[PDB]
């Protein structure tokens, strides 16, 4: 159960337990469903929003 408090995700709620999703670039864990990520439909690569609109 460990970090199940932890805030990663933009949307500023904690894993809480629900699927998670790591940033191929930023390392950011981000929610799943945050992610907009069907969970049928996982991709290999995800990149977050943010570094998607780097610089
Ligand atoms: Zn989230
Ligand atoms: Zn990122």
């Not at 894993?15 to 864990?29: D, K, L, S, V």
Request: glycine share 4%.
């Amino acid at each position: 159960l460990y970090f199940q408090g932890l805030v990663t995700c933009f949307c500023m709620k904690p894993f809480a337990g629900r699927p998670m999703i790591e940033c191929n670039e930023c390392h950011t864990w981000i929610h799943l469903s945050c992610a907009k990520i069907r969970k049928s439909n996982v991709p290999e690569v995800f990149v977050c929003q943010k570094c998607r609109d780097s610089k």
